Design a protein around this ligand. Structure first.
Ligand SMILES: CCc1oc2ccccc2c1C(=O)c1cc(Br)c(O)c(Br)c1
Length: 472
């Protein structure tokens, strides 16, 4: 009978707008802490330390000291034992440390801990560990927000994000940085599920479109907050602090938001629920029907399609979270991409949805997965002679893969007996954050050709979208 009390107490109005505003803002920084592994773990050009150069014809010394490399560059992993002055066979690996290029980044984690050359597989694992953390944090938090409430967990998760982000920026060794990022990811997943649920519960029956639109449209401007804070702070020890600092201020003000009124009824905390409903009504200024609440009323109140959705969610999660955490290979000028993956997400999603829904729901579902797969697949074909075309396709693709996140939820998830969609939307997400941990692991296949990662990242969504045409 809870919708009746909600209608008696409000619906739209004022409070349901300030709550949405105060809950949407953390989503931007939540995005910031997930795509931050693109400007923090950046790999600049690295060469081998030499006694002749870099103190104890500059080009002549560079040519005589380092053997030439395959890709029209000096070798990044080998050096001459002695100066081969015959150049107007016998080589050893770098043992005096590397020298890096300090022209766009001052200090990345790679520069600090030498994650190059033989120790290359370490870099694509710090993101898999992060996503695994997200999964294990979104699994536990489910059976946590039922014995602790729903508002307290959000505040403690804000505090945990703040503390873990601050601590992870002052570690002296790699494994501690891997572990504290794991904790950060778990807390971030908890924040994102609790915020979604809190936005869900307090709203009326019209929670379907508006709130789920606001959550996504929040992630988009998010990308543009990374782009920006980056252009500003370049180092890596001063970036994690500058990103995790706002969460403490968020926790400080999160102590006043009223707790969800539906959970309080089912556990027997009637008096606090009455107080929360009364304060919500007072905020909403609809203090006319609040008199009727005299406790007694609240006392009385107290298979093929599923598989197709699973594959669609899995394909969406795998390609995006494995080709968007490597934008240094999709082009150049990183502080422009990871900053245009957003202004090309909102017009594109709106226009594509509006145009393709009238054709049909299944046509819209199919057209949103084959298109970006083909777009990404075409990227390897075009040579590097024209940069603008080399970089244009990826933005539109990764942009349209974002369109699945919305299209496959507010237009999909009805492919079932149609009782309530909330028992299917959650089931889809387990595969997304359970295939992104199987994401950047594909980038570990840089050896044995460099085109295979892009080929896989393009073919998998293509096959998923094409098989989606086999619904009957
Ligand atoms: C543009 C689409 C999009 O952009 C992001 C940027 C940062 C974090 C999540 C997302 C995101 C998601 O839809 C999403 C949400 C959750 Br929850 C996940 O576990 C995974 Br994987 C992906």
């Amino acid at each position: 009978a809870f919708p009746e009390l909600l209608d008696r107490v409000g619906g739209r109005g004022r409070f349901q707008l300030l709550q949405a505003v105060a809950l949407v803002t953390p989503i931007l920084w939540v995005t910031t802490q997930s795509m931050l592994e693109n400007f923090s773990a950046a790999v600049p050009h690295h060469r081998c330390w030499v006694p002749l150069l870099d103190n104890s014809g500059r080009d002549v010394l560079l040519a005589v000291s380092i053997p030439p490399g395959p890709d029209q560059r000096p070798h990044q992993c080998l050096r001459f034992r002695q100066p081969q002055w015959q150049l107007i066979a016998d080589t050893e690996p770098c043992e005096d440390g590397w020298v890096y290029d300090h022209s766009t980044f001052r200090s990345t984690i790679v520069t600090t801990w030498d994650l190059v050359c033989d120790s290359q597989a370490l870099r694509p694992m710090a993101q898999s560990i992060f996503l695994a953390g997200i999964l294990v944090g979104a699994a536990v938090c489910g059976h946590a927000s039922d014995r602790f409430g729903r508002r307290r967990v959000l505040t403690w998760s804000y505090l945990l994000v703040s503390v873990s982000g601050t601590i992870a920026a002052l570690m002296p060794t790699f494994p501690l940085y891997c572990l504290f990022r794991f904790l950060v990811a778990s807390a971030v997943a908890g924040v994102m599920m609790n915020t979604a649920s809190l936005l869900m519960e307090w709203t009326s029956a019209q929670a379907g479109p508006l709130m789920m639109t606001l959550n996504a449209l929040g992630f988009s401007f998010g990308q543009v907050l990374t782009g920006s804070v980056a252009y500003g702070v370049r180092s890596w020890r001063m970036l994690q602090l500058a990103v995790s600092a706002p969460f403490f201020l968020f926790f400080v003000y999160s102590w006043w938001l009223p707790e969800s009124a539906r959970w309080l009824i089912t556990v027997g905390r009637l008096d606090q629920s009455l107080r929360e409903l009364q304060r919500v009504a007072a905020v909403n200024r609809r203090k006319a029907e609040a008199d009727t609440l005299t406790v007694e009323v609240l006392r009385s109140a107290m298979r093929l399609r599923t598989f197709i959705s699973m594959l669609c969610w899995f394909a969406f999660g795998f390609t995006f979270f494995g080709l968007a955490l490597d934008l240094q290979a999709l082009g150049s000028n990183i502080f422009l991409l990871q900053a245009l993956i957003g202004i090309v997400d909102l017009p594109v999603k709106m226009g594509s949805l509006l145009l393709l829904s009238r054709l049909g729901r299944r046509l819209c579902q199919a057209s949103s997965l084959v298109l970006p797969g083909l777009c990404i697949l075409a990227n390897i074909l075009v040579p590097r002679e024209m940069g603008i075309l080399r970089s244009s396709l990826a933005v539109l693709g990764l942009g349209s893969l974002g369109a699945a996140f919305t299209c496959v939820t507010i237009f999909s998830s009805e492919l079932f007996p149609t009782v309530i969609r909330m028992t299917a939307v959650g089931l889809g997400q387990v595969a997304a954050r359970g295939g992104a941990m199987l994401g950047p692991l594909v980038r570990l296949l840089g050896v044995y050709g460099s085109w295979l990662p892009l080929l896989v990242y393009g073919v998998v969504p293509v096959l998923s979208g094409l098989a989606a045409l086999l619904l009957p």
